[PDB]
Design a protein around this nucleic acid. Structure first.
Lengths: 144, 97, 150, 129
RNA sequence: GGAUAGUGGCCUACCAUGGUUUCAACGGGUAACGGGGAAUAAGGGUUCGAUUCCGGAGAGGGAGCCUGAGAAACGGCUACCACAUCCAAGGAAGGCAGCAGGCGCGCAAAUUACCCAAUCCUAAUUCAGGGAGGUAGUGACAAUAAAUAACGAUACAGGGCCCAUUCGGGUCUUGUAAUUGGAAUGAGUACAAUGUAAAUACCUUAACGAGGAACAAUUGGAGGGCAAGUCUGGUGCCAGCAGCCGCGGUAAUUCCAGCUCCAAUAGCGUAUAUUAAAGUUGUUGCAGUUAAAAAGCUCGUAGUUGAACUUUGGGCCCGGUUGGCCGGUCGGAUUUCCAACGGGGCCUUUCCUUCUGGCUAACCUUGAGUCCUUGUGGCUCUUGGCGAACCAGGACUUUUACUUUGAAAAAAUUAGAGUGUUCAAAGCAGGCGUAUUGCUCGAAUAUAUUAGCAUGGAAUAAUAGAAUAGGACGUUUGGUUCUAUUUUGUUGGUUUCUAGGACCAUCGUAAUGAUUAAUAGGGACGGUCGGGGGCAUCAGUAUUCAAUUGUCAGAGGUGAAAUUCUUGGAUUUAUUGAAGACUAACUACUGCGAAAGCAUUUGCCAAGGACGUUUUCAUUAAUCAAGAACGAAAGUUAGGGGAUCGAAGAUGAUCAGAUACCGUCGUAGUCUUAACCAUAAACUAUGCCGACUAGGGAUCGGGUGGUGUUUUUUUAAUGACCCACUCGGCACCUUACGAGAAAUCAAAGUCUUUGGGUUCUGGGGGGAGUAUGGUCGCAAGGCUGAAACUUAAAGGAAUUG
RNA sequence: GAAUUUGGACAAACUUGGUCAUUUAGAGGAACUAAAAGUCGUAACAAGGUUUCCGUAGGUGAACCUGCGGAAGGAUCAU
RNA sequence: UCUAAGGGUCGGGUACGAUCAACUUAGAACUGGUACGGACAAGGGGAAUCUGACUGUCUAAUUAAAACAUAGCAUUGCGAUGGUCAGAAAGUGAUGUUGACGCAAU
RNA sequence: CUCUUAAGGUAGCCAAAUGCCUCGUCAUCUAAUUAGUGACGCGCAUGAAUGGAUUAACGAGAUUCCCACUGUCCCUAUCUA
């Protein structure tokens, strides 16, 4: 009879089987309590702030070959040292040593993105202004 | 949560039977697998049959045969013995010649 | 199916459609019951009696020939045994097996068989206790097994 | 252990039908089965049958015609609440205009349209088309 | 029983030993007060529910308390704790989870604004007070409508229409034009009014307010997915883009720019969370021979599931909802007609609860019947029958699950009737006048699973009632108990009958009471069946060693060499002995066992299958978390045994290296005793029980029959054969009727025409069957068993090459 | 009828340990993961040149090798 | 200063009355400058490392230990015309009133 | 790759009661540590019954730290025989 029970008074056994067998998706723990809050860099949050420890040049994965220009951002709440990408061409030139920044997820719900190994957070804002604005030269980096 | 992996493919037998070592190379092997041949030859060859018959005391004589059952290890069977390898259809057939 | 063994047998005894009859049969209703009672006195089971009468004499089946089954007929005249026949037989088997095991040591299969038999016995006990032909809070056990054979 | 005699009977019927026959020795009968066959016979899906009798079991030999696409059973026999039968008809039947979800109520064993007309419900047994 | 406002282990004195629990208690976690509901939904569902109605509240954390009908209040006290306010250092005052406001956290969120005009509430109270509330400002959280340009004529080319009169003019329209003109606006300012509590806005409104350099639209993209460049300049695996696949290494349809174009448009991206997609959670509805998955095997409690069988039917009436002549009415309906659909009665052995009954009601009631087409289509009366139609009561009427119908099912929200919000989201309004001191329709309707309640139904599914009858009726007949309103003369005492309470007694009536015996299960019995198991006991050969040997130079060993042992007779034949070793050949798509696994003889000890069976039992059963027996080989523990083969080891070769393959020895082991051990490619990597579907032979084990053949003692009996048949197996051959991704499959079939019962396991690969914690084990290890982090494929079948 | 005491329950609070949960430092050790071109060999996939693999025990710079039993996912469906 | 609970023997016209003894244990009041095992008697405890396992033994007059010993393991020789040892020899002796699961030596 | 032995220290373990150099270097205990403890280990000169390693229990053994407690000490005073 196709494995599972088809008793009229079973129900219990069915629901318990589901409760057992539901555990096969990382997203299932997110809905109960949150893996984000116990482990993980971003504490159940979309974006996260931090301070730039150092500028980095990451070797891209094959078949690609380049140096990707990233930063070790130590966060403010948790204090975890996390790698982070710098979007657009140049833009590593705008950021300095020990500046407040704002990070966001790279796109793929955690995890890597394309040829970049390890890094999973794109930089959005630096010293209270967007990278995009700095790049296009609409607004400038406030020194004071 | 919970997540892992793998397994594989198939053939038929019976239960268990004891092995009989390879007559050539001393590898162990059961008897559903086996690969066996009956060595049933005369002591004398085709060349020797006359030279003997001539020198034979007793009229009619005898000329018996050395009988023995030889068991191979599949590996060794293909090394020499009549087994070789057959097509997709021919490997279903069981007739000897 | 079989409860324990792997076999799938249907060796059984097909009663005919005839409930009344046999028509060819002679005799009276008192004679057969008397015969039953005789072999009960002699000290045999409903089964064995049923065999012996049927094969050697004329009783085709107890319900057809009389208007009752053999067990009931035994019960009526105060000759029904202390416990059910089949269960008793099983117990007897089990005791014997245990005895056999006692003399041996390295044997395994017979132990397994014993265990199987014990299971069966337990199941039977559950049944009889449920319908209340044995006493409630009555139980078979290994220690007082050979005492129960009497 | 046959968990449902009716089930197995229906299965046998369907097997025979698929094989393309006109007869079935089905076993070991029930009043329910008989009623089922009264419904089916009523709506043309089986030719006139003969319940044979050996005291203990009672077998049947249904002379089925060939109109039958598929008869089948729904175990466990669920409880149905009039508003629900639509969903069943939507689910398991081929079409709206034909096919009969047969079922048991306190009135009796019958097709779903009859139950609608009567305006009662109870359990579900199976389906025929 | 105090205390309470009243109940109760609320609280204890005394006494008891309970209460709860695999139907998941108790404990732990919660980024949990809850619901009404929100997101999204074919149906089923999945996620979220902080955000003006209840004991738990809670007023920084607790604990205590007066006042009062009401408080364990906190815009009230009391203390302690943590922090913190001001001093003329003696001492005083505090609590913001009501508005204003914002340190660190941040991913994230506003004026120390004006007013009781609404809306309400409180006060002795229309008159005061209310940061409750309203009003704005802040406001791209969300929603609604929504400008950013329109239009001629001219310069060209078309296309449809009117006179259907020729080439005559046209109402016109579809485009393109460094062809050129008048027109129409809102943003915006704003006399003014309106608006409001008073202002700002908006709805009106004079006045000024388009010609592009203006009153200027962005945000993404342009290889595919996925709408749009085989354009230009730069760049040279550099910089960069790229959710995914991939672009870039000297010609970039992807980068950095231009140009052009395509979407969406005052918004568009981007991040994380979720829903659909997702049948990648699977009840409906998945997968498990390999793609990820069936526990080694069997037992076994819980749970789930579980053969049939018990008024079926056959009649006779009654009235409904439907079909249609008749439209005898003027595309409205009536009443008698053939059938359907389910109803309601009464009869066919059918209390289909009632017992005491009044109305005894519908009536053997009929006192002389009539304004009827005789054929029974039907308004019409007269003194007096059967208890539910109305209530009065009581006697006892398996116990539910299921389902019909009903209320009870707060509002906003949801679906949704109406309606000028200038349309629309919305809102609940409004419409109409004889706009003379008036008239009037609305603010419906539906939804509310489960449980609780009443209420029919009685099929299906459970469950009791008569089997050493303390069993139902009862006109029987003693009796033993207990009760009793009225009356005897009244309130009371004992009494007689009297009516009923139960209990017991022998007689009295009923066909006096026991459903089958499931190609379900168990059990006995029958002669057979087997390399099934145990306990011994017998044989066999070889292998090695020894003695006797008979003999004579090379014997072992490989691909070839070497180690090696060799007249201190070696290898080698024959005669014996000793020790363990394993059951050859026969031995097979042969046999048993639950498996692991078991082959010499013989005996003893129980056990088991199939079969036979007009034997008995009578649903006893199918699978099964927990728990439990067995469980190869290798290991471990202490004895034995210790011949061959042989982890380690030594070695001689090999080779660039060889501690590997090839050789010559060789300790643990291989064997066994008693213990452990629990894994295996424990493999038919195919759960078990049940049913049903295709043919064909062959075989193991019973059984049936045949004037069959064969074998003795021609003949009898069996055995062995042959033939035909049938049961239960180890299996096979041929198709695919079907199934499948195929390979292949008689079961992997009867599954999108998706449900016979049940257990177990899997949800991309790795990380990892690791870590930790439990648990078993002497140990080796075993069972149970994650995480961070990483990655686009791993993989499975086939197809070529 | 105020201070003020006797007893009592209700008891915050601190001192002490016992805990159950959640985090977090740490010399050093041992893993895993990724990262265009790092050394050593070449262990599987063709009979990968000794057929693979499974269990278990030992050995070895490293793949691995060896034993005993098993399987075939074999290089054989076969007298 | 009380209460309770632990028992012995005698009794039945063929349920329990009378009495006799101890000490133990508990519970309650009531009470004192909160003292009460009142003097007397009578354990400091933990976290670790080193070392030998342990109880035991010894330098009687400086060393009590980590030294010796031990159980357990391993080894060796020995079948009595024997092994290990004694004796000046001896018709001598210890192991030995022993026998390889024993004796001797490590 | 090489000289070289009878073989070249294996499993373990350590500045250990075994390590000169040494107060080894790193961590921990403290205000501060040639003490102790955990680590590291080409160990002058560890190491397998000349027994190696681990240990529950025991210790008039050797060692360090902590709680408790003290005239040991600051800082000496007093009383009795």
């Amino acid at each position: 009879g196709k494995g599972k029970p088809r008793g009229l008074n079973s129900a219990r056994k069915l629901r318990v089987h589901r409760r057992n067998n539901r555990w096969a998706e990382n997203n299932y723990k997110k809905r109960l309590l949150g893996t984000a809050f116990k482990s993980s860099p971003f504490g159940g949050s979309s974006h996260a702030k931090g301070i730039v420890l150092e500028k980095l040049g990451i070797e891209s994965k094959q078949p690609n070959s380049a140096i990707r220009k990233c930063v070790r951002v130590q966060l403010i709440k948790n204090g975890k040292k996390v790698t982070a990408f710098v979007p657009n061409d140049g833009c590593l030139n705008f950021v300095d040593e020990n500046d407040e920044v704002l990070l966001a997820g790279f796109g793929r719900k955690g995890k890597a993105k394309g040829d970049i190994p390890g890094v999973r957070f794109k930089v959005v804002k630096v010293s209270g202004v967007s990278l995009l604005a700095l790049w296009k030269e609409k607004k400038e980096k406030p020194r004071s | 949560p919970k997540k892992r992996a793998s397994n594989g493919r198939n053939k038929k037998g019976r239960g268990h039977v004891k092995p009989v070592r390879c007559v050539n190379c001393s590898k162990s092997i059961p008897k559903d697998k086996a690969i066996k041949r009956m060595a049933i030859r005369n002591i004398v060859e085709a060349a020797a049959v006359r030279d003997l018959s001539e020198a034979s005391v007793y009229p009619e004589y005898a000329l018996p045969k050395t009988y023995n059952k030889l068991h191979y290890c599949v590996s060794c069977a293909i090394h020499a013995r009549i087994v070789r390898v057959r097509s997709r259809e021919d490997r279903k057939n069981r007739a000897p010649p | 199916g079989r409860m324990h063994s792997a076999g799938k047998g249907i060796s059984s005894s097909a009663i005919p459609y005839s409930r009344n009859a046999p028509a060819w049969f002679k005799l009276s209703s008192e004679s057969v019951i008397e015969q039953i009672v005789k072999y009960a006195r002699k000290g045999l089971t409903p089964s064995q009696i049923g065999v012996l009468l049927r094969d050697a004499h004329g009783v085709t089946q107890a319900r057809v020939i009389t208007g009752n089954k053999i067990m009931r007929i035994l019960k009526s005249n105060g000759l029904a045994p202390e416990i059910p026949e089949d269960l008793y037989y099983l117990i007897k088997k089990a005791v014997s097996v245990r005895k056999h095991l006692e003399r041996n040591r390295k044997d395994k299969d017979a132990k397994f068989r014993l265990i199987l038999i014990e299971s069966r016995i337990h199941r039977l006990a559950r049944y009889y206790r449920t319908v209340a032909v044995l006493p409630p809070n009555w139980k078979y056990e290994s220690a007082t097994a050979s005492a129960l054979v009497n | 252990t046959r968990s449902s005699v009716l089930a197995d009977a229906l299965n046998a019927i369907n097997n025979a039908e698929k094989t393309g026959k006109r007869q079935v020795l089905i076993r070991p009968s029930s009043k329910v089965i008989i009623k089922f066959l009264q419904v089916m016979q009523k709506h043309g899906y089986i030719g006139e049958f003969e319940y044979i009798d050996d005291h203990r079991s009672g077998k049947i030999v249904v002379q089925l015609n060939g109109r039958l696409n598929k008869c089948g059973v729904i175990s466990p026999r669920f409880n149905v609440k009039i508003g629900d039968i639509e969903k069943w008809t939507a689910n398991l039947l081929p079409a709206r205009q034909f096919g009969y979800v047969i079922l048991t109520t306190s009135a009796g064993i019958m097709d779903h349209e009859e139950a609608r007309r009567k305006h009662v419900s109870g359990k579900i047994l199976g389906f025929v088309y």
